[PDB]
């Protein structure tokens, strides 16, 4: 009701536990202006009422004045305050400091929209990655750098998508938006004539593949991509797309090689400039890397079409990675003191979604480890509280409320954890989703927040008591986006590309599952959040439909829990939530059983 | 190494030994079980001055060397030279210490206790392995094939086995532990080369004959047609040169080897063949269950590398079945080392955590711990 | 409960337990009171990781299965197998838990306390049935074709039973509990098949024989003549084959079973005849009343579903009676399942709401509430 009537009275910005709850209106409230830039320059989180500029100054004065690098935590549903609170701090610093470079972030974002952002449920232009915008400050705390970076590039989404979750939008941006001239340069089969883009939303909701594809091209250019660098980028989008269509025919016994009809390989290889025959036959016949030798136990055509999906996955992954690279090339100043920095967060936080699958397990577990930093720094400020007074009570490390949810996803052997049970079954020369759910069930006790479902439900499904609240996972379609027998022969062919920019994408050439890759992307964004004083800005939905001035406190706490801020509030409660000041106690409780102690009494303690 | 057991693997058969580790679909290293030692070691005009020629090292100067086999038909026989081979496998071939990684030493099912003891004690006294699985040389061929059940053959250079996977899996009367393998194939090739006139008496010349076979050999689907073909060097009487000036013209004798595996009548005593005791394993399985194993006639080993092993063995096993039941051979994308592949893949999943002899398992339960962990 | 009580129907006897729903004319499934349990359930190529095979699921893998019985002689011989039976019937075949689904099971009259206690307990301790019902197997077959009065012989593939209804209802010394079921014709069949040379020992082969008796079988109208014909493969020597090539040309043996239906003493038991005990349960009343018993001899259940049954039994009751009181036999529109069909009808009827065993009925009134509700 505080949150609700506050937002309703305008106060999107409510403190909660110890966090700047931005019950995001999705309009960057003019609490980011130079007046508020300076009304907070000098004014950290708790110094002033709840603000991305209170916390933006926490960050800054840690950067200039405390000479400590910073990271404005900004968690929650993708685009539910992310760009809101991120550009909030960006401008705070832009005038507090010298910003300019984050401005290419805003033109990075459409490209991030293209190849890194994939649609999601509570957001259409949703970053299916979490990015951080590290604004790099002089020792004087002056924005001489700003470099953005995306992790949780759901290469799975680059191949197999989620519900209300398009691929990385460009795949769509490509077919609709990339011209049919490109559609043939990019040999762009239709959205669902491509194995990917199987998600129904051809365009982004409230958006279009055409216009955000042109955002894609032009913004790639503003980052430094030629429309032929862009067009090879797009050939990659489309050739990834082609890959799922490239099927390598299998045999009854565990065999090695068959795909005669490499016309989808013909397409991927025209786009990538690579050889259709090398691509094909070497997915037929990859040199399986086994030790002192790399033996032609050529991947069973199981692993061959798995190398196909792996090629598409890692192909588009390094596509958007080189893309975000150019993003940062023209984005950041190559000159910066940057002796301090501020990593402002734009991630899809605790995602309360309907599809909870490989990509969504990795996303929700990512936000698990992120809100662990969040609630642990809430523990930090709660301890700061108890040490501020003489408080015999230093209540539990509060990010610990997250941990059993987390190794639940992580444990790789010794009966292992969920995503790493997936990883096991991808370490097999074959695919074993059956042994995957074998491990899910037998390991549900080996996890501490694994909710292995009922006698009949657990058989392929289960749950994972995420810190988003429990999130039910059917882990049966994860190996196909995780097996990743990335065919080093075919990816080297992608380096052997005749499309030279395609080679630039995978100048880098079986096991190493994608579950581990997405845990990696988590840990990356997690360090970018935690490596500093995690600056307490929260991105809260009064409506994930990107609305302003409308609220139900329902969606408020939905994102609070999604930012862990409901948990952070419980955690202030899990600690010392309130603090009746001494003289507050004297006023309040002279009438309440003081009786020799009139209010305004002398002895702070003894009164 | 990786987040698995990532357990090392000595796919140590009796004619070949394969180094490696988990998370891999094919042998990391292949060096014969044959460890060699020169005849005139010391200083010669010819030789290369070594002592224990671990693996193909043996095969070098057979004109002036000799060649022993630390494993003979899965019986890990010279566990000094098998320690040479385990040093080779993990400490040299793997070049990752046996002492550091769980290792996996492959063995003939129902191997003598002594060989098991060697494998374990040695991983845990000569190679101080944290936790080594003495893995069933055939059941590994099974695990590599993408299967965990069926007719489980490991045929040839090295040693032949056939594990049934039914109500029973491993018994001194349920698994074919076939000492009829590419070793007997080699010995017979030697005998018939002497018949033609190619006198081979020393184990150096027997390994000459083995390297002949393993390359000049044929799983004789029809021994006799190609035998008449190979009375002269047509396509099936092939030559082999030792670099000292020795050319060996191997007649029908090429495919006279694998037939020893299948049809041991080539030798002249009262013994049994490969597919026969293979079906003996399948027969411990019930009517329905011999029918069952028939589907997975998993095969591996050295004689599985001579032309026709799938056709020969499956012709035979299909015939070795109630005609109400058909049989199909599983051919891994690598058979002779599908022992290695299965051991390493067992090492890859959680399964190796369930299957090693720990170093402690040994030091406590003696080397009998093999029996106490894996036969 | 449940105006049309939706009440699940388990025609449970020694053989076919029939699954289904309120108000239907044939069971939603049929599966004998037999649960299969393999020998060792090893990791076979053909295995199931399960041990409890309810119904014909027992009949399935007999090559490795031993086949136990939930009911025999209308006696629940295994309530845990009847747990299996109602998991099958309701949880599996009705695919609707007997929990929350009233279960108009069946149960023979004069069943020992054990069977009623079980049926209710299973239904209320494995299956927590909101409203179980075990109605009279025979009176259920009565209710199948829409009857309410007459002597309704029901011998399902469970116990042989007859409840002579008249202007009132039957007597406890005039109610047939014949030492007979589908199991007895089965076992006699096994013995007589072994006689001619079709040997059966195990419950595997005995249940081979039960599926013979249920299908390779015939109500013998001229038993010994057909026997002579079928001592050689001429007219009733009809081969069931165990799928290993075990030729069982069930000759005389087939219709030798329903001869045990009409004469259960063929096995060695001192029981009476089925149609004879119809006549007996008929006579035990007054002229007008025993006559009403004479009249309507509904032959019903599974073992009265062999070729020639009704008129055989009818000639029987006529010859086995005075000429002062006539006898007629009713063939239910689905006779083998008439027990089930009357269960389903009583279920749809208000009568299940007038006759059923509630879960609480057992929990408070003891399991004797089945005694209070099964008659």
Cα torsion at B354, B282, B173, B69 (round to 10°)?
-70
Q: Are residues C295 and C351 in the same domain?
A: no
Specify the DSSP class assigned to residue A469: B
A279: closest CA of chain B, how far (Å): 20
The C-alpha atoms of residue A586 and residue A580 are separated, in whole angstroms, by: 9
C238, β-bridge pairs = C250
The C-alpha atoms of residue A529 and residue B30 are separated, in whole angstroms, by: 48
Interface probe with B: pick from A287, A290, A407, A437, most Cβ of B within 10 Å: A290
The C-alpha atoms of residue C267 and residue C247 are separated, in whole angstroms, by: 24
The C-alpha atoms of residue A129 and residue A118 are separated, in whole angstroms, by: 8
Structure tokens at B154: 């490991």
Cα angle A371, A376, A377; round to 5: 100
The C-alpha atoms of residue C277 and residue C279 are separated, in whole angstroms, by: 5
Q: Are residues B300 and B255 in the same domain?
A: no
Specify the DSSP class assigned to residue A467: B
Establish if B273 touches chain C: CB-CB under 8 angstroms.
no
* Set of chain C residues whose Cβ sits within 8 Å of the Cβ of B166: 42-44
Specify the DSSP class assigned to residue A486: -
The answer to whether B139 and B342 have CB atoms below 8 angstroms apart is: yes
The C-alpha atoms of residue B200 and residue B193 are separated, in whole angstroms, by: 7
Q: Are residues B127 and B215 in the same domain?
A: no
3-state secondary structure of A503: helix
Tell me the pairing of strands B176-178 and A461-464.
unpaired
Structure tokens at B368: 């009998």
Residue C341 backbone dihedrals phi, psi, to 5 degrees: -70, -40
Structure tokens at A76: 């929650």
The C-alpha atoms of residue A423 and residue A443 are separated, in whole angstroms, by: 14
Q: Are residues B129 and B23 in the same domain?
A: yes
Burial of C323 (0-12, 13-18, 19+ CB in 10 A): exposed
Distant-in-sequence, close-in-space partners of A549: CB < 8 Å, separation ≥ 6: A7, A8, A25
The C-alpha atoms of residue B359 and residue C1 are separated, in whole angstroms, by: 67
The C-alpha atoms of residue A593 and residue A570 are separated, in whole angstroms, by: 29
Q: Are residues B277 and B317 in the same domain?
A: yes
Tell me the pairing of strands C103-107 and C131-136.
parallel
Whether B146 sits inside 8 A of A297 (CB atoms) is no
The C-alpha atoms of residue C224 and residue C222 are separated, in whole angstroms, by: 6
> What range does the domain containing B111 cover?
4-34+71-134+337-371
Residue C240 backbone dihedrals phi, psi, to 5 degrees: -90, 140
Question: How far does chain C reach from its first CA to its final CA, in angstroms?
Answer: 20
Q: Which residue has 């409901």 as its token pair? A: A566
From B267, B296, B314, the end of a domain falls on B267
The answer to whether B158 and B74 have CB atoms below 8 angstroms apart is: yes
| Residue (of A517, A491, A521) closest to A239 by Cα position | A491
The answer to whether B325 and B315 have CB atoms below 8 angstroms apart is: no
3-state SS of A127-163 is CCCEEEEEEEECCCCCEEEEEEEEECCCHHHHHCCEC
Distant-in-sequence, close-in-space partners of A80: CB < 8 Å, separation ≥ 6: A24, A26, A122, A123, A349, A539, A540, A541, A544, A546, A559
From C267, C300, C318, the end of a domain falls on C267
Residue A306 backbone dihedrals phi, psi, to 5 degrees: -65, -35
Residues of A labelled as active-site residues: 78-79, 83, 123, 126-127, 349, 351
Residue A49 backbone dihedrals phi, psi, to 5 degrees: -50, 170
C328, β-bridge pairs = C296
The C-alpha atoms of residue A531 and residue A527 are separated, in whole angstroms, by: 5
| Residue (of A113, A119, A118, A106) closest to A148 by Cα position | A106
Which residue on chain C is closest to B288 by alpha carbon?
A: C63
Which residue on chain A is closest to B350 by alpha carbon?
A: A413
Which of B165, B287, B322 is opposite residue C45, by nearest beta carbon?
Answer: B165
| Residue (of B176, B28, B203, B192) closest to B109 by Cα position | B176
The C-alpha atoms of residue B316 and residue B312 are separated, in whole angstroms, by: 6
Tell me the pairing of strands B246-250 and B160-163.
unpaired
Phi-psi region of C23 (alpha: psi -120 to 50; beta: other; left: phi over 0): left
**Which DSSP string do the residues of C286-328 spell out, in sequence order?**
-HHHHHHHHHBEEEESSTT-STTHHHHHHHHHHHSS-TTS--B
* Set of chain C residues whose Cβ sits within 8 Å of the Cβ of B285: 44
The C-alpha atoms of residue B344 and residue A428 are separated, in whole angstroms, by: 10
The residues in C 206-245 lying below 8 A from B, measured between CB atoms, are 243-245
Burial readout B248-263 (b: 16 or more C-beta within 10 A, e: otherwise): bbbbbbbbbbbbbbbb
Cα–Cα distances in angstroms (integers) from residue C270 to residues A466, B68, B168, C71, C260, in the given order: 69, 78, 45, 21, 12
The C-alpha atoms of residue B46 and residue B65 are separated, in whole angstroms, by: 10
Cα–Cα distances in angstroms (integers) from residue A333 to residues A52, B48, B88, B242, in the given order: 24, 63, 54, 69
The answer to whether A125 and A82 have CB atoms below 8 angstroms apart is: no
3-state secondary structure of C39: coil
Longest dimension (CA), chain A: 97
Specify the DSSP class assigned to residue A22: E
The answer to whether C335 and C301 have CB atoms below 8 angstroms apart is: yes
The C-alpha atoms of residue A445 and residue A448 are separated, in whole angstroms, by: 6
Q: Are residues B110 and B94 in the same domain?
A: yes
Distant-in-sequence, close-in-space partners of A338: CB < 8 Å, separation ≥ 6: A136, A137, A138, A144, A145
B150: closest CA of chain A, how far (Å): 13
Distant-in-sequence, close-in-space partners of A429: CB < 8 Å, separation ≥ 6: A254, A288, A297, A299, A300, A303, B25, B144, B146, B341, B345
The C-alpha atoms of residue A466 and residue A449 are separated, in whole angstroms, by: 7
Specify the DSSP class assigned to residue B160: E
**CA A12 distance to own-chain centroid:** 24
The answer to whether B334 and A256 have CB atoms below 8 angstroms apart is: no
Alpha helices in A188-275 (DSSP H): 209-223, 227-245, 263-271
Which of C44, C63, C245 is opposite residue B149, by nearest beta carbon?
Answer: C44
The answer to whether B133 and B352 have CB atoms below 8 angstroms apart is: yes
Residue C246 backbone dihedrals phi, psi, to 5 degrees: -90, 100
Q: Are residues B46 and B116 in the same domain?
A: no
Cα–Cα distances in angstroms (integers) from residue B131 to residues A412, B104, B120, B294, B373, in the given order: 18, 9, 9, 34, 11
Interface probe with B: pick from C38, C45, C64, most Cβ of B within 10 Å: C45
Which residue on chain C is closest to B284 by alpha carbon?
A: C44
Cα angle C176, C180, C182; round to 5: 130
Specify the DSSP class assigned to residue A297: -
Number of neighbouring beta carbons within 10 Å of residue A98? 19
The C-alpha atoms of residue C152 and residue A295 are separated, in whole angstroms, by: 77
Which residue on chain C is closest to B147 by alpha carbon?
A: C45
The C-alpha atoms of residue C212 and residue C250 are separated, in whole angstroms, by: 8
The C-alpha atoms of residue C367 and residue A145 are separated, in whole angstroms, by: 82
Number of neighbouring beta carbons within 10 Å of residue A7? 26
Structure tokens at B300: 């591996």
Structure tokens at B52: 């224990």
Cα–Cα distances in angstroms (integers) from residue C371 to residues C114, C169, C339, in the given order: 10, 17, 18
The C-alpha atoms of residue C207 and residue C69 are separated, in whole angstroms, by: 11
| Residue (of A115, A146, A109) closest to A131 by Cα position | A109
Sign of CA dihedral B286, B288, B290, B296: negative
| Residue (of A409, A443, A423) closest to A515 by Cα position | A423
Structure tokens at A462: 């289960």
**CA A386 distance to own-chain centroid:** 33
Distant-in-sequence, close-in-space partners of B265: CB < 8 Å, separation ≥ 6: none
* C-alpha atoms less than 13 angstroms from C-alpha of C351 in its C-beta half-sphere: 18
The C-alpha atoms of residue C369 and residue A334 are separated, in whole angstroms, by: 89
Phi-psi region of C114 (alpha: psi -120 to 50; beta: other; left: phi over 0): alpha
Tell me the pairing of strands A288-289 and B29-31.
unpaired
Which of C39, C64, C244 is opposite residue B324, by nearest beta carbon?
Answer: C244
The answer to whether C210 and C70 have CB atoms below 8 angstroms apart is: no
Which residue on chain A is closest to B348 by alpha carbon?
A: A427
Which residue on chain C is closest to B297 by alpha carbon?
A: C45
Q: Are residues B226 and B247 in the same domain?
A: yes
Whether A290 sits inside 8 A of B20 (CB atoms) is yes
Establish if C270 touches chain B: CB-CB under 8 angstroms.
no
| Residue (of A556, A128, A514, A21) closest to A351 by Cα position | A128
Q: Are residues C344 and C356 in the same domain?
A: yes
The answer to whether C151 and C297 have CB atoms below 8 angstroms apart is: yes
Whether B165 sits inside 8 A of C43 (CB atoms) is yes
Count of the separate structural domains present in chain B: 4
**Which DSSP string do the residues of B320-369 spell out, in sequence order?**
SS-TTS---EE--SSSTTHHHHHHHHHHHSGGGGGTPEEHHHHHHHTTTH
Q: Are residues B58 and B75 in the same domain?
A: no
Burial readout C145-183 (b: 16 or more C-beta within 10 A, e: otherwise): bebebbbbbbbbbbbbbbbbbbeeebbeebbbbbbbbbb
Specify the DSSP class assigned to residue A294: E
Establish if C247 touches chain B: CB-CB under 8 angstroms.
no
| CATH code for position C44 | 2.30.36.70
Phi-psi region of A474 (alpha: psi -120 to 50; beta: other; left: phi over 0): beta
Whether B295 sits inside 8 A of C40 (CB atoms) is no
Structure tokens at B35: 């460890």
Distant-in-sequence, close-in-space partners of A482: CB < 8 Å, separation ≥ 6: A156, A358, A422, A423, A426, A513, A514, A515
**CA C277 distance to own-chain centroid:** 17
| Residue (of A194, A127, A208, A200) closest to A166 by Cα position | A200
| CATH code for position C309 | 3.30.420.40
Distant-in-sequence, close-in-space partners of C109: CB < 8 Å, separation ≥ 6: C136, C137, C138, C161, C163, C175, C177, C374, C375
| CATH code for position C192 | 3.90.640.10
Which of B168, B295, B324 is opposite residue C42, by nearest beta carbon?
Answer: B168
**CA B75 distance to own-chain centroid:** 10
Establish if A249 touches chain B: CB-CB under 8 angstroms.
no
The answer to whether A495 and A478 have CB atoms below 8 angstroms apart is: no
DSSP element (H, E) containing A341: strand A340-346
The C-alpha atoms of residue B48 and residue B42 are separated, in whole angstroms, by: 9
Distant-in-sequence, close-in-space partners of A461: CB < 8 Å, separation ≥ 6: A437, A453, A472, A473, A474, A475, A476
DSSP element (H, E) containing A73: strand A70-75
Cα torsion at B223, B228, B229, B232 (round to 10°)?
120
Interface probe with C: pick from B149, B164, B286, most Cβ of C within 10 Å: B286
* Set of chain C residues whose Cβ sits within 8 Å of the Cβ of B296: 45
Which of A295, A430, A435 is opposite residue B146, by nearest beta carbon?
Answer: A430
3-state secondary structure of B35: strand
From B68, B93, B116, the end of a domain falls on B68
Q: Which residue has 């108890």 as its token pair? A: A386
The C-alpha atoms of residue C309 and residue C154 are separated, in whole angstroms, by: 12
C62: closest CA of chain B, how far (Å): 9
**Which DSSP string do the residues of A351-393 spell out, in sequence order?**
---S--SHHHHHHHHHHHHHHHHHHHHHHHHHHHHHHHTT-S-
C89: closest CA of chain B, how far (Å): 28
B160: closest CA of chain A, how far (Å): 21
Q: Are residues C114 and C205 in the same domain?
A: no
Q: In what order do the strands lie in the sheet with C297-300?
A: C176-178, C160-164, C151-155, C297-300
Whether B333 sits inside 8 A of A415 (CB atoms) is no
Q: Are residues B17 and B102 in the same domain?
A: yes
């Amino acid at each position: 009701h505080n949150l609700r009537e506050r937002y309703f009275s305008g106060l999107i910005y409510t403190y909660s536990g110890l966090f700047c709850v931005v019950i995001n209106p999705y309009k960057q409230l003019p609490i980011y202006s130079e007046k508020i830039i300076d009304m907070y320059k000098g004014k950290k989180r708790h110094e002033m009422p709840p603000h991305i500029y209170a916390i933006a100054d926490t960050a800054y004065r840690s950067m200039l004045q405390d000479r400590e690098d910073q990271s404005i935590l900004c968690t929650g549903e993708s685009g539910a305050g992310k760009t809101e609170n991120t550009k909030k701090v960006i401008q705070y610093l832009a005038v507090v400091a010298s910003g300019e470079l984050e401005k290419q972030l805003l033109q990075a974002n459409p490209i991030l929209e293209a190849f890194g952002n994939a649609k999601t449920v509570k957001n259409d232009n949703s970053s299916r990655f979490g990015k951080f915008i590290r604004i790099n400050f002089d020792v004087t705390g002056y924005i001489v750098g700003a470099n953005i970076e995306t992790y949780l590039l759901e290469k799975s989404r680059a191949i197999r998508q989620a519900k209300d979750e398009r691929t990385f939008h460009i795949f769509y941006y490509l077919i609709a938006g990339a011209s049919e001239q490109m559609r043939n340069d990019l040999l762009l089969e239709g959205f669902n004539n491509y194995t990917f883009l199987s998600n129904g939303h051809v365009p982004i909701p409230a958006q279009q593949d055409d216009e955000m594809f042109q955002e894609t091209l032009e913004a790639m250019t503003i980052m430094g991509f030629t429309e032929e660098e862009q067009t090879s980028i797009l050939r990659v989008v489309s050739s990834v797309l082609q890959l799922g269509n490239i099927v390598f025919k299998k045999e009854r016994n565990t065999d090695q090689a068959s795909m005669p009809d490499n016309t989808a390989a013909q397409k991927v290889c025209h786009l990538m400039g690579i050889n259709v025959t090398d691509f094909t036959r070497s997915i037929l016949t990859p040199r399986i890397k086994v030790g002192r030798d790399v033996v032609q136990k050529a991947q069973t055509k199981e692993q061959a079409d798995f190398a196909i999906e792996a090629l598409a996955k890692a192909k588009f992954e390094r596509l958007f990675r080189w893309i975000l690279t150019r993003v940062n090339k023209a984005l950041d100043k190559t000159k910066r003191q940057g002796a301090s920095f501020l990593g402002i967060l734009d991630i899809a936080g605790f995602e309360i979604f309907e599809i909870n699958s490989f990509e969504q397990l990795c996303i929700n577990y990512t936000n698990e480890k992120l809100q662990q930093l969040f609630n642990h720094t809430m523990f930090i400020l709660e301890q700061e509280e108890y040490q501020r007074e003489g408080i015999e009570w230093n209540f539990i490390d509060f990010g610990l409320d997250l941990q059993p949810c987390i190794e639940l996803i992580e444990r790789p052997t010794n009966p292992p954890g969920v995503l790493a049970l997936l990883d096991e079954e991808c370490w097999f020369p074959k695919a074993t989703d059956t042994s995957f759910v074998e491990k899910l069930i037998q390991e549900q006790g080996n996890h501490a927040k694994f909710q292995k479902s009922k006698q009949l439900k657990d058989k392929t499904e289960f749950c994972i008591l995420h810190y988003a609240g429990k999130v039910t996972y059917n882990a049966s379609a994860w190996l196909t986006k995780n097996m990743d027998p990335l065919n080093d022969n075919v990816t080297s062919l992608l380096n052997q590309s005749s499309d030279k920019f395609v080679a630039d994408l995978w100048k880098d050439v079986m096991f190493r599952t994608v579950g581990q890759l997405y845990k990696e992307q988590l840990t990356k964004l997690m360090t970018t959040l935690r490596n500093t004083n995690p600056n307490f800005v929260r991105c809260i939905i009064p409506n994930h439909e990107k609305r302003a001035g409308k609220l139900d406190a329902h969606l408020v706490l939905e994102q609070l829990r999604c930012n862990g801020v409901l948990e952070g509030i419980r955690i202030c409660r899990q600690g010392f939530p309130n603090r009746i000041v001494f003289q507050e106690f004297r006023q309040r409780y002279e009438i309440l059983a003081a009786n020799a102690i009139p209010k305004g009494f002398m002895d702070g303690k003894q009164a | 190494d990786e987040d698995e057991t990532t357990a090392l693997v000595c796919d140590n058969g009796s004619g070949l030994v394969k180094a490696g580790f988990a998370g891999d679909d094919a042998p990391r290293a292949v060096f014969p079980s044959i460890v060699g030692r020169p005849r005139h070691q010391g200083v010669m005009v010819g030789m290369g001055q070594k002592d224990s020629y671990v693996g193909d090292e043996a095969q070098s100067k057979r004109g002036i060397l000799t060649l022993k086999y630390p494993i003979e038909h899965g019986i890990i026989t010279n566990w000094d030279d098998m320690e040479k081979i385990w040093h080779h496998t993990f400490y040299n071939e793997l070049r990752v210490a046996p002492e550091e990684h769980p290792t996996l030493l492959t063995e003939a099912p129902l191997n003598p206790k002594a060989n098991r003891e060697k494998m374990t004690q040695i991983m845990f006294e000569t190679f101080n392995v944290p936790a080594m699985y003495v893995a069933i040389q055939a059941v590994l061929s099974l695990y590599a094939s993408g299967r965990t059940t069926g007719i489980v053959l490991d045929s040839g250079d090295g040693v032949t086995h056939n594990v049934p996977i039914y109500e029973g899996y491993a018994l001194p009367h349920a698994i074919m532990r076939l000492d009829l393998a590419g070793r007997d194939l080699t010995d017979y090739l030697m005998k018939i080369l002497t018949e033609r006139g190619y006198s081979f008496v020393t184990t150096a010349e027997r390994e000459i004959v083995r390297d002949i076979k393993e390359k000049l050999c044929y799983v004789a689907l029809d021994f006799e047609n190609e035998m008449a073909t190979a009375a002269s060097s047509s396509s099936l009487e092939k030559s082999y040169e030792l670099p000292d000036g020795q050319v060996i013209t191997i007649g029908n004798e090429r495919f006279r080897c694998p037939e020893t595996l299948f049809q041991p009548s080539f030798i002249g005593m009262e013994s049994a063949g490969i597919h026969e005791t293979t079906y003996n394993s399948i027969m411990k399985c019930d009517i329905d269950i011999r029918k069952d194993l028939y589907a997975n006639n998993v095969m591996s080993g050295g004689t599985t590398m001579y032309p026709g092993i799938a056709d020969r063995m499956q012709k035979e096993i299909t015939a070795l079945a109630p005609s109400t039941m058909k049989i199909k051979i599983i051919a891994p994308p690598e058979r002779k080392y599908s022992v290695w592949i299965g051991g390493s893949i067992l090492a890859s999943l959680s399964t190796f955590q369930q299957m090693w002899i720990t170093k402690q398992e040994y030091d406590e339960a003696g080397p009998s711990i093999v029996h106490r962990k894996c036969f």
